[PDB]
Write an enzyme that holds these catalytic residues in place. Sequence first.
Site, short mmCIF file in Angstrom:
data_model
loop_
_atom_site.label_atom_id
_atom_site.label_comp_id
_atom_site.label_asym_id
_atom_site.label_seq_id
_atom_site.Cartn_x
_atom_site.Cartn_y
_atom_site.Cartn_z
N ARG A 83 0.85 -1.19 0.00
CA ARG A 83 0.00 0.00 0.00
C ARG A 83 0.88 1.24 0.00
O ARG A 83 1.93 1.26 0.64
CB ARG A 83 -0.90 0.03 1.24
CG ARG A 83 -2.22 -0.70 1.09
CD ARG A 83 -3.18 -0.34 2.24
NE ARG A 83 -2.59 -0.62 3.55
CZ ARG A 83 -2.17 0.31 4.41
NH1 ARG A 83 -2.29 1.60 4.15
NH2 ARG A 83 -1.65 -0.07 5.57
N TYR A 222 -1.03 -4.07 -6.53
CA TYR A 222 -0.75 -4.76 -5.27
C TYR A 222 -1.82 -4.57 -4.19
O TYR A 222 -2.23 -3.44 -3.90
CB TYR A 222 0.59 -4.28 -4.69
CG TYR A 222 1.14 -5.21 -3.65
CD1 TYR A 222 0.78 -5.10 -2.32
CD2 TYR A 222 2.03 -6.22 -4.00
CE1 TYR A 222 1.28 -5.97 -1.36
CE2 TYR A 222 2.53 -7.10 -3.05
CZ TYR A 222 2.15 -6.97 -1.74
OH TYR A 222 2.68 -7.84 -0.81
N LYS A 231 -9.60 -2.67 1.99
CA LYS A 231 -9.88 -1.52 2.85
C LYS A 231 -10.45 -0.28 2.16
O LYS A 231 -11.12 0.53 2.81
CB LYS A 231 -8.68 -1.19 3.75
CG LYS A 231 -8.44 -2.27 4.82
CD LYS A 231 -7.23 -1.95 5.66
CE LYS A 231 -6.89 -3.06 6.64
NZ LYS A 231 -6.31 -4.25 5.95
N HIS A 251 -11.92 -1.58 11.89
CA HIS A 251 -10.72 -2.38 11.66
C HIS A 251 -10.52 -3.33 12.85
O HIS A 251 -9.68 -3.11 13.74
CB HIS A 251 -9.53 -1.42 11.48
CG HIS A 251 -8.27 -2.09 11.03
ND1 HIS A 251 -7.03 -1.56 11.29
CD2 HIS A 251 -8.07 -3.22 10.32
CE1 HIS A 251 -6.10 -2.36 10.78
NE2 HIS A 251 -6.70 -3.37 10.19
N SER A 273 -0.92 -2.45 13.31
CA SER A 273 0.02 -3.47 12.87
C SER A 273 1.07 -3.76 13.94
O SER A 273 1.25 -2.99 14.89
CB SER A 273 0.70 -3.03 11.58
OG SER A 273 1.36 -1.78 11.77
N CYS A 275 1.16 -5.99 16.27
CA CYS A 275 0.64 -6.32 17.60
C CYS A 275 0.11 -7.75 17.69
O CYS A 275 -0.56 -8.11 18.65
CB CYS A 275 -0.45 -5.32 18.02
SG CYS A 275 0.15 -3.64 18.24
N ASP A 298 -9.62 -8.94 10.25
CA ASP A 298 -9.31 -7.62 9.69
C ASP A 298 -10.43 -6.61 9.86
O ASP A 298 -10.24 -5.59 10.52
CB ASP A 298 -8.88 -7.72 8.21
CG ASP A 298 -8.11 -6.49 7.75
OD1 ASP A 298 -7.41 -5.89 8.59
OD2 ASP A 298 -8.19 -6.13 6.55
N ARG A 391 2.56 -11.95 0.98
CA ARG A 391 1.17 -12.25 1.33
C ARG A 391 0.71 -13.63 0.95
O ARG A 391 1.17 -14.21 -0.03
CB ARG A 391 0.25 -11.26 0.62
CG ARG A 391 0.49 -9.81 0.97
CD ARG A 391 -0.06 -9.51 2.34
NE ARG A 391 0.36 -8.19 2.83
CZ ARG A 391 -0.32 -7.48 3.72
NH1 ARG A 391 -1.46 -7.94 4.22
NH2 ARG A 391 0.14 -6.31 4.12
#
Length: 600
Positions: A83, A222, A231, A251, A273, A275, A298, A391
């Site tokens: 992203r 991507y 998102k 989220h 992110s 965590c 997510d 990914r």
Amino acid sequence: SHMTSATIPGLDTAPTNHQGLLSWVEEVAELTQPDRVVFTDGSEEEFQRLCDQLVEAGTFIRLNPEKHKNSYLALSDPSDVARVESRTYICSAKEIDAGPTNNWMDPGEMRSIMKDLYRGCMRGRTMYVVPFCMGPLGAEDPKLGVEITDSEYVVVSMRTMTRMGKAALEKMGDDGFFVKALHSVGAPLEPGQKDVAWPCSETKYITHFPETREIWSYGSGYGGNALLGKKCYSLRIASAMAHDEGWLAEHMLILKLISPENKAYYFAAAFPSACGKTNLAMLQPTIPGWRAETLGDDIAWMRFGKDGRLYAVNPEFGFFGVAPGTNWKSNPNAMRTIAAGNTVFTNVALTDDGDVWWEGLEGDPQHLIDWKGNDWYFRETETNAAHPNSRYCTPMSQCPILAPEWDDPQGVPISGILFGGRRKTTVPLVTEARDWQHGVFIGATLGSEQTNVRRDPMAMLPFLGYNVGDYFQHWINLGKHADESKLPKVFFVNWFRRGDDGRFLWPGFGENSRVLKWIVDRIEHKAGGATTPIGTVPAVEDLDLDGLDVDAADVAAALAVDADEWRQELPLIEEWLQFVGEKLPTGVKDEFDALKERLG
């Protein structure tokens, strides 16, 4: 050479039942000038046909089917691996409605730039028209979209990430509303020109028009830039919809916890992110009689039901997980999900037997082909074998601990909303809010470690479709107008507090189930805790530590609330509240003042 839409192959045979859709497709094709147009149906026959074409183009190689059935590896252009936040825009009519957490540009200005980019951009390419549904198809206010793309890789991944094709198209009927999502990789081809495996452009835009619910993407193939049912729709456009329509697009993972009573509890949990949120989404409890199942890792969409409770649904249909770090020892459930195949992997490494590998995974492979197509050697090569943001894209239905409720269109009633971050100090292992408005403040001031403490409100910092202050007011409003006794209780969790010597004060992972048990007991009024200036925090004696080989003093330290540390926290929160700007709700400032007063 320019062709009127009418004469472009594929438009002659288009679906005509929905004219709004057809007219849009024709208008776009007139602009972008593809060689042909294809409406996708999501079928298995179509999926294998597209995959054959992707293998032929070199975009995919077919992984060893003995290890992953029906699975493929794609390697991207090294300029297109993530992203791009700096190129992501919220183009509301007025700048204030984008707000300080968003990148804004005048919508007229943006449209002039992007319409210019889109002119002729699909020359030499097939333009795909991809109908899809967000959430289970049975919904009452069901959120549909159509993504136009010139990327076959996008189509295949959209089939996994959303409910794609025929069923969605039928749901649109003849004049149903849908989100218009336009995408191009920005790499037009001349006739007979050899293409590359991963086309893309140096020029990138990921643009959102919140009022009209439109998304325009250019230049990247991507992930979240190009899979517009992720998102861009699920959080950015959807949060604007939720703002206007009285619900929440968030989220959050969705977790089902079952107690020894055999009663189920559903929790929605927001983390930034880094965590370990995926580990938590697929929790394996370590205490007898407790079980866990997942509904998502997510996105959660929450709406009030007739009974006054908040119900969560996962709008997605697949997992799009960061591969590195995923392994058998810490997330066997993710590995089992991937093991069942039907997976597209992007930028991971290839083993000599046609399997896949990434940093963190078991196996100590002696040789690999890395994500750039080069030889990699164990304990020698100094570059990562898999890209750090690589990914796996895998159907959710393959997860062995998928909750049976995962495809229920009404969703699941939420008992607790959790917020979390990574903090070496200050913030205890778990805290319960004093009430809903305090809960909103806890979410709004969510702090997590950065290169130092970054504020990431409700873990939505990069994903809000409108002004952050108005978003806080929206959370306050929903609570105000609800039946208080049916609202989820709000908690904050920090799995990551450290001693001064750098030890982890809490062992985490499956042991997080012990914290979740306290949360369930608090929901049932079966557990106590200390009233502290920041909320209710358990003492060591309030937690089930049976069977846990852990220093009680470390757990007490994990749970400590030190007034001095919290006085130091106050000016950090205050500078954040100032940054939120003119739209900061008085209700949020009220909670700051109340915290300051309780601290003395």
